[PDB]
Amino acid sequence: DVFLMIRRHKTTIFTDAKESSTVFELKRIVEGILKRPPDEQRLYKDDQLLDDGKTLGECGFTSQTARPQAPATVGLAFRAFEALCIEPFSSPP
Amino acid sequence: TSLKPRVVDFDETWNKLLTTIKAVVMLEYVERATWNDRFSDIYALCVAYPEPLGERLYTETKIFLENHVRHLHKRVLESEEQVLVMYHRYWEEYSKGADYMDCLYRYLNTQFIKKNPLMEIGELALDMWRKLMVEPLQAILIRMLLREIKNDRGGEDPNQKVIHGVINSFVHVEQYKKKFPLKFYQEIFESPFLTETGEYYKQEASNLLQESNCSQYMEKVLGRLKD
Amino acid sequence: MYVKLISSDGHEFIVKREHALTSGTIKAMLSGPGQFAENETNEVNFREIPSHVLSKVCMYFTYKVRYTNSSTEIPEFPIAPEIALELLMAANFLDC
Amino acid sequence: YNLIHLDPRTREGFTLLHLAVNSNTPVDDFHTNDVCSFPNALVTKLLLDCGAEVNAVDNEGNSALHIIVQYNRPISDFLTLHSIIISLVEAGAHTDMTNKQNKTPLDKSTTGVSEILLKTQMKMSLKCLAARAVRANDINYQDQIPRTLEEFVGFH
Amino acid sequence: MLIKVKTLTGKEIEIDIEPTDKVERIKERVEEKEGIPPQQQRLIYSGKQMNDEKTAADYKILGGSVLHLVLALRGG
Numbered sequence: 001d002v003f004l005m006i007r008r009h010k011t012t013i014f015t016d017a018k019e020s021s022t023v024f025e026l027k028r029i030v031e032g033i034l035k036r037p038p039d040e041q042r043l044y045k046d047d048q049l050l051d052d053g054k055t056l057g058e059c060g061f062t063s064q065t066a067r068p069q070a071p072a073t074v075g076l077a078f079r080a081f082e083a084l085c086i087e088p089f090s091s092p093p
Numbered sequence: 094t095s096l097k098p099r100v101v102d103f104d105e106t107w108n109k110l111l112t113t114i115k116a117v118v119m120l121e122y123v124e125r126a127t128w129n130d131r132f133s134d135i136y137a138l139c140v141a142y143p144e145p146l147g148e149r150l151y152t153e154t155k156i157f158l159e160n161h162v163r164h165l166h167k168r169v170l171e172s173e174e175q176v177l178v179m180y181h182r183y184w185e186e187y188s189k190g191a192d193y194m195d196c197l198y199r200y201l202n203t204q205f206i207k208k209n210p211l212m213e214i215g216e217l218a219l220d221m222w223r224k225l226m227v228e229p230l231q232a233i234l235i236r237m238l239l240r241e242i243k244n245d246r247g248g249e250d251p252n253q254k255v256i257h258g259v260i261n262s263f264v265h266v267e268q269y270k271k272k273f274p275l276k277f278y279q280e281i282f283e284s285p286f287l288t289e290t291g292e293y294y295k296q297e298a299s300n301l302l303q304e305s306n307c308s309q310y311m312e313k314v315l316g317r318l319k320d
Numbered sequence: 321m322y323v324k325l326i327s328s329d330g331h332e333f334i335v336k337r338e339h340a341l342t343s344g345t346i347k348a349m350l351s352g353p354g355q356f357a358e359n360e361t362n363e364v365n366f367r368e369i370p371s372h373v374l375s376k377v378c379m380y381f382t383y384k385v386r387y388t389n390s391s392t393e394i395p396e397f398p399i400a401p402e403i404a405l406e407l408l409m410a411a412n413f414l415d416c
Numbered sequence: 417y418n419l420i421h422l423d424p425r426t427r428e429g430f431t432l433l434h435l436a437v438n439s440n441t442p443v444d445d446f447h448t449n450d451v452c453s454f455p456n457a458l459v460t461k462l463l464l465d466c467g468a469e470v471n472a473v474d475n476e477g478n479s480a481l482h483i484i485v486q487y488n489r490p491i492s493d494f495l496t497l498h499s500i501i502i503s504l505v506e507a508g509a510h511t512d513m514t515n516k517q518n519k520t521p522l523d524k525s526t527t528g529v530s531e532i533l534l535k536t537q538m539k540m541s542l543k544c545l546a547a548r549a550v551r552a553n554d555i556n557y558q559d560q561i562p563r564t565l566e567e568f569v570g571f572h
Numbered sequence: 573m574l575i576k577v578k579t580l581t582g583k584e585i586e587i588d589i590e591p592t593d594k595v596e597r598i599k600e601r602v603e604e605k606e607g608i609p610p611q612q613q614r615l616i617y618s619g620k621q622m623n624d625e626k627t628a629a630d631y632k633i634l635g636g637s638v639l640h641l642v643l644a645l646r647g648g
Contacts, residue, residue, distance in 0.1 A: 003382055005375075011332035014378050016340070016386070033322055033334055033360075068382040069397045090329055090373040093400040094328075095368050096409035098562055117353060128352045129365045132345055136413055137368075140562035148323065195349035203415050204564055207508075339458045343542075387540070389646045391614070391623065396539075399549035405557065408550055411543035412565050491618060494640040495580060528619040529640070536614060536644040 002056060002066035006030060008041070008076035009085055016068070019057025023050060036078050044075035044084050098142035106121040106134060107153055117197065118161060118190035128197075132216045136200050147205035154198075154214060158221045162187075166226045176230075177217045177237060181255040216269035223277065233284060234259075239289050246293065323350065332369035339381045341352035343414020369413070373406045377414055417466045429474030436460045437484040437500060443535075453493075455484060457500035470509040471571075477516025479526075481509055485521050490529040498533055505537045512544040513571040547572040575602055577615070577639035585641070591633035595622035602641070614642035 006013040006026070013033060017025065027038045034041075043050050050059055065074045077084045114130055116123050139147045165183050172179040194216025195202075200308070202213040212220060238259070241251050263278035270276070294317075301313050323340045325333040341347045349364045357361045362414055366374060376399075397408065425431055434443045436459050443449040455502055460480075464470065473479055481504055490497050505511060511534060514520055522538075525531035547569050550557060575587035586605035589598035599622060600610035615622050617631040617639055 003386065005378070007323045011334060012375060012378075013334045014336075014382055016382070067395075068386040069379055069395065071379060071382065087330070089331070089375060090370040091329075092370075092372050092400065093406065095370070096406070096413055097560060120353075125352065125354070125360055125363070128364050129349055130367065132349060133366075133368050133413075140564070157480065191349070196351045199348045199415065200413070204412075208564070215341055309359055349435070377542065384435040384540060384542075391621075391647065397545055399545060401549070401553045404546055404553065405555050405561070408543065408546035408557075408565060408569075409561055411546050412562060412568075414542065415540070416541050416543075491640075494578075498580075498642075528621070529616050532614070532616065534609070536642060537588065572574050 001063045002061050003068040004061060004066045004070075004072035004074055007073050007086055008034070008078065014071060017056050019061075019063070020055060022055045022056070023052045026056060027052065030076065030077060034078070036067065039075045040079035042081065044077070046073075046075070047084065096136075098140050099137065100142045101137060103138065103141075103146055103149060106138065107150070110134060111157060112311060113196060114157070115161070117193055118187060120186040120190055124286070128229070131197060132200070133197065139200055139204060147201060147209075147266070151201070151205070155221075158218055159225060162221045162225045166230060169226075169230065173233075176233065177241065177259060178252070180226075181252075181258045181262070184258060187218075187222065188265060190259075190261070191215060191222070194218055200220065213269075219266045226270055226280075227263070227266065231281065235285055238282065239285060241285070241294065243289065322344060324361045324397055325374060326363055326365040326367075327374050328367060328369060331374065334339040334376055335378055339342060339385050342381055342384050343377070345413060350379060357362065369410055370406065372403055373410050376400070376403055376407055377410055420463070420466055422469050428476065429472075431468065431472050431474075431480075433460065433463050433468045433470065433472065433480045434474055434478075434483060435450065436463060437480040437504075439487050439489075441473075453496070454494060455487065455500060457496050457498075457503055460500050461503040464503055464506050467507070470507060471513070473515070478520075479509075479513060479515070480504060481511065481513075481521045482519070482524055485525050485527070485530045486535065487527070488528070490527050493520070494529065495566060501530075501533050501537055510539070511538045516530060541549055543568060544572065573638055575639075576636040577602055577641060579606060579641065580643060584637070589628060591628045591635075594625035594627050595631075596625045598628055598643070600638075608643065609648070611648040612643075612645065614644050614647060616640050616642055 001018045002021075003016045006015060011034065013018075013030065015026070015029060023043060024038075026043065027041070030036070030041065031038065037050075045059055045061075048059075061072060063073075075084045075086050110131065113127060129183060135150075138150055139145060165187075169176050169179045192215060195213070195218065198214040202215075202299065205211070206213045238256065241256060245251055245256075260278075262281060263282055264275060267274050267277045273279075297317065298314075301310060305313060321337045322334050323337050323346070325335070325340075327333065337350070341350065346364065347392060350356075380397065387394060420471075426435070428434075430438070437455045439455050442452045443452050447517070453561075465486060470480060475501055481501070484497070484500055484504065487497050515524075522531050522534055525534070551569055551572050557566060561569075573588070573590045575585055575589070577585040579585065579588065583606060585602035587598045587602035589601065595615065595617075597610075599615045600614055602615070603610060603613045604634065606613075617634075618637065621642070
């Protein structure tokens with residue numbers, strides 16, 4: 001039901017899920033593509049932090065804003081806790 | 094840079110593209126970064142400012158393919174007795190290479206070939222394979238294919254992979270002609286093989302008429318049919 | 321599986337293979353020589369195109385996957401006016 | 417095929433395809449209109465089997481798709497309206513092209529059946545929406561995009 | 573309420589659904605006597621196509637009529 005892009009630093013992973021889906025499923029998804037243990041990354045609502053017990057659709061990630069044409073920019077930060085470092089896109093004309 | 098048209102000289106980029114594609118058509122190893130950058134190279138050349146050299150690149154690719162297939166034809170001619178193994182081995186290097194080249198020239202077909210009377214690279218690479226490798230070197234191929242399958246019929250078990258590839262390397266040539274794609278294989282191999290099989294079983298049945306009576310004739314014919 | 325894309329200035333992008341094969345030149349890029357024995361990254365280098373247009377084309381991929389062959393209202397895809405010129409050239413490069 | 421490759425166009429810019437898809441084309445009354453009815457899908461299909469340029473434009477800027485949707489009888493002869501359209505989009509009929517008068521074929525429908533048939537035959541593409549956005553906002557594309565992209569912009 | 577909806581060759585469709593029924597299940601029986609699966613035929617009610625439930629009373633509650641359905645694929 002939700003369509004959001006996982007933006008961490010250099011990489012940006014586009015993903016679809018459901019409101020009933022939980023944060024733990026997103027962590028499992030990002031583990032198999034980025035190879036980081038779940039305690040090493042923390043998901044961000046803009047700059048607000050989240051947890052794992054809450055579902056994906058619980059923390060303001062609704063279908064009317066996480067549409068595929070305008071996906072939500074959820075931020076991640078990998079440990080080595082490192083801060084949320086996301087560089088901006090290249091300058092449009 | 095970018096997708097904006099620019100003025101670029103065709104010579105050295107075409108030579109480097111030749112270096113890539115010669116390894117491409119020989120089933121060699123190329124770099125993925127090299128392979129991916131060749132997409133951008135073909136795109137930039139096809140809309141190179143101010144004159145699209147897609148016609149020029151098309152002609153140069155035709156020249157390269159003709160030269161390569163003619164050199165391979167000359168090489169196969171040297172293996173006069175074992176050209177079936179040579180043709181089968183070099184076809185495998187070429188057919189997958191032909192499809193890889195077809196995918197490589199995807200922008201050329203979508204923008205230039207179909208939007209301007211012209212033949213796409215994948216069809217043309219097969220077309221260069223028939224008019225310069227198959228049709229000229231045809232009589233020896235068909236006669237020794239008939240000889241090999243006759244040997245298989247009698248007592249031998251030759252290389253099934255080689256014959257199967259070469260025979261399918263006829264239908265695989267005309268896969269791009271929607272109207273009667275089987276037409277080339279319908280006559281080049283089919284009719285002489287039809288006649289040879291008919292004559293061989295005619296003489297076989299003539300032999301078995303007196304070899305055994307009408308009782309064992311049924312079992313022998315069933316066995317020959319099953320084989 | 322998931323595919324990977326190199327932008328002009330860093331800016332890695334990871335898309336599902338079925339979501340990315342809709343575009344033309346990506347399909348041939350995945351159809352290059354080599355069997356890709358790893359089958360988890362198979363990255364492609366888009367040196368020419370910028371990063372924002374890559375994000376926009378990934379958004380288009382997601383929209384096309386979601387709204388394919390549907391009888392719904394087909395909502396308008398938002399196009400930034402500045403990126404529209406670059407996105408048109410990208411769609412010229414990225415077939416369909 | 418020879419006649420098509422001798423690029424026949426009328427005074428309205430109509431090709432043989434344009435008149436084939438046109439209902440307004442007169443048919444001779446003397447022992448002819450009893451058989452030949454226009455628009456006829458099969459001959460148009462035969463035009464597609466003969467490689468007729470489906471993306472041609474007339475003096476009005478309309479293509480064959482722009483004219484076939486203007487048929488005012490989708491009830492009396494639905495098939496002659498439907499089988500042509502699927503035959504129309506069979507070799508590169510661009511459903512999102514826009515005429516000189518700046519009208520989408522879906523806009524020039526005046527028939528729910530015709531527009532829903534076009535939508536079922538319509539398929540989305542990023543180039544279509546990008547060109548429509550560029551043209552709707554009037555960004556200078558001349559001497560900055562490939563010439564085929566300029567032709568596509570002119571199509572939109 | 574019998575149905576006499578035409579098809580690509582002017583065939584017959586037996587919806588056998590009253591005007592109070594929904595076209596989501598009315599078109600299921602119409603294509604059952606035709607051959608198409610229910611969620612595949614884009615039935616056109618002589619100017620409009622069904623969507624969601626699409627109660628048959630909305631389409632003027634016509635009795636039988638000539639519903640020229642669209643046989644487009646991949647609609648499921």
